[PDB]
Each structure stands twice: as C-alpha cells, then as structure tokens.
Amino acid sequence: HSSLHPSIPCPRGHGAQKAALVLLSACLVTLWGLGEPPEHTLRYLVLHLASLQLGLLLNGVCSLAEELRHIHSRYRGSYWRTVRACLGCPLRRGALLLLSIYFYYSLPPFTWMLALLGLSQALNILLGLKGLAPAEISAVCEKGNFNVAHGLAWSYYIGYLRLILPELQARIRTYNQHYGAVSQRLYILLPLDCGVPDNLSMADPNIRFLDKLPQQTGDRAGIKDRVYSNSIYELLENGQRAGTCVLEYATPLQTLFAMSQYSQAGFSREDRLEQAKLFCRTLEDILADAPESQNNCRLIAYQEPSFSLSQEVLRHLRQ
C-alpha cells in the first residue's frame, strides 16, 4: 500500500482467483446436489472446453489474417513468429487442439456443429462481442506494464533524478558555504490534478523565490553541455520565513496534462487522473529501491479540494 496519498491504488491482487475458487466449490456442491450422472457431467464439461478451444483456433486464424501483413516490419520476416504471436505457443495450442478435435468428434453432427461454431465465432469478431471490459484491460496493462505513466516515471528517474541527486548533495553544501542554510534534500511536488504552473509563487504566494544552486552540467545524447538547474524557495508561516528548501514540480505531470488537451493524443481526463496516480506509485517504488536516493529526495503528493500547499511542504519539511 502506497504511503504517498490515500488516493493511490495498490497493485491488483489475487481476489479474482479466490472468487473463482468459491465459484468452483459452489458449482461442485450444486452438481452433487442435483444428482445427475457424473459421467454425463464430465462429458459435457470436456465438450464445452473443446468447443472453446476450437473457437480460439478460429479467432487466432482471423487475427493471423491481419498479422501476416505486418510479418516483415513487426515479426522480422518469420511466419512462425507471426503464428506464435497469434496463437501464443503452437506446441501447447496444437496439443490442446488435437485433443479437442478428437474428443468432440468421438464423444457424440460434427460437421454441422463445426460450421455453427465458426458462424458464432465470426459474429464475435464482426459485432465485437469479445471487447474486454475496462477492468480487464486495466489489469492487463498493469501486469504487462503497458502504461503511459510507467515510461514517464522511468524517464524521470533515469534522466533527471539519477544524474542530479548524487551531485545535489555536494552542490547544496557548496551553496551553504558560499552563503539560512537550506535543507539537504530535494522536494518534489506531485499534483494529482496535474496543475503544475511554471511559476511556483502563483500556486501559493506564501512560497517565495531565493537564489539558485550552482549549475550542474553534463554531456548527453550528442549535446555537449546539458545544464541542470535547481531553484531555492523560502516558506512563509505567520508572514515570516519558516523554512527553506530546494523545491520542484514533477515535470512529467505537465506532459500528462498537455496530452489531455491535445486531441491527437487520444488521452482523456479520466486517463490523466489514473495515470497521474500510477506515475506517483511507480516513482515511489523505483526510488525506494534505487541506490542513488540514499536520503537525497522527498516526494510530496497532494490533491486540491484555499489550499494549504505552503503548509504541505512545511509539514514534510518539519517532518
């Protein structure tokens, strides 16, 4: 469970499997109560599974009709890779297919039923009856890591935080020697609504600006001088300075907001809120394990309901 903010969803668990197990127990008890012959039960069950497997075969063929066009670009020119992409594993799938064919032909008309199954399966593709529910899609994305926020969080850590955080420790001490000493941490603001104004004082006038740390420079991706700059802010309580820290907005959140505005992005407000929460979770998880963040940085997540933002930083700064 995340410690940043209550609104952050936890990773999905096994609850579906437990519900399926309860359903299995109930179904078996019901079959025991009904008193129908066990052999007929087994026959019907195996026939149903065989029919499902054959429907899977036909759906895979329909998908293969599409994937073969991409054979060169996506599948590097191998027909077998395309076939596996459509069927998952041709060996296991072929074994189950042969078993299903044998059992469905033996146990019982085969040809008429096969045609009826193909007709049913074709309508599923054309009508779209097998479109997955939002929860099913969300679970698939989270397990596979097919998420916008996943890439943004790793991009943020790999590029910015990985480089600057080690140097941050040295730079802050240099500033304190040159100059009221500032806290020895970088504080990152995570607005779950993705506000992120470019001037921090506009967010809260109690946060006012102070001189900058020494610039950090590095050679990167063919640009010989990438300059990394950090600003210092003072926090006002009762109208006087009550804290001083190096402060940031998570810039990737600004990308999520902009994606929500552009029509070409295909990115909605609901996607923005879900991905914003996900971005916080994965960034929290990575920094926990990351060697670079010994004690160097702090994450602050908040959700505006007259807001406390200045007090929010102070609370963690005092903490």
Ligand X SMILES: CC1(C)C(=O)N(Cc2c(F)cccc2Cl)c2cc(C(=O)NCc3c(F)cc(F)cc3F)ccc21
Ligand Y SMILES: CC(C)CCC[C@@H](C)[C@H]1CC[C@H]2[C@@H]3CC=C4C[C@@H](OC(=O)CCC(=O)O)CC[C@]4(C)[C@H]3CC[C@]12C
Ligand Z SMILES: Nc1nc(=O)c2ncn([C@@H]3O[C@@H]4COP(=O)(O)O[C@H]5[C@@H](O)[C@H](n6cnc7c(N)ncnc76)O[C@@H]5COP(=O)(O)O[C@@H]3[C@@H]4O)c2[nH]1
Q: Does 159 bind a second copy (CB under 8 A)?
A: yes
Report the alpha-carbon angle 250-256-261, nearest 5. Answer: 135
Of 227-266, binders to a second copy (CB under 8 A) are 227-231, 233, 247-252, 254-255, 258-266
Q: Does 284 bind ligand Z (CB under 6 A)?
A: no
Of 236, 301, 221, 252, residue with least CA distance to 152: 252
- Cβ distance to ligand A1BBH smaller for residue 30 or 199: 30
Contact call for residues 304 and 191 (beta carbons, < 8 A): yes
CA 249 to chain centre: 20
Q: How far apart are CA 99 and CA 49, in angstroms?
A: 11
155 annotated ligand-binding residue: yes
Of 46-85, binders to ligand Y (CB under 6 A) are 76-78, 80-81
In order of 100, 119, 145, the CA distances from 104 in angstroms are: 6, 17, 38
Of 5, 1, 3, 2, residue with least CA distance to 193: 5
DSSP 8-state symbol, 242: E
160 annotated ligand-binding residue: yes
- Cβ distance to ligand Z smaller for residue 43 or 162: 162
Q: Does 75 bind ligand Z (CB under 6 A)?
A: no
Q: Does 302 bind ligand Z (CB under 6 A)?
A: no
81 annotated ligand-binding residue: no
> Which residue in 21, 38, 44, 220 binds ligand X (CB under 6 A)?
44
Mode of pairing for the β-strands spanning 232-237 and 240-249 = antiparallel
Contact set with ligand Y (CB under 6 A): 18, 76-78, 80-81, 90-91, 94
Contact set with ligand X (CB under 6 A): 44-45, 47-48, 51, 113, 116-117, 120
Contact set with ligand Z (CB under 6 A): 155-156, 159-160, 221, 223, 226, 228-229, 248, 251-252, 255
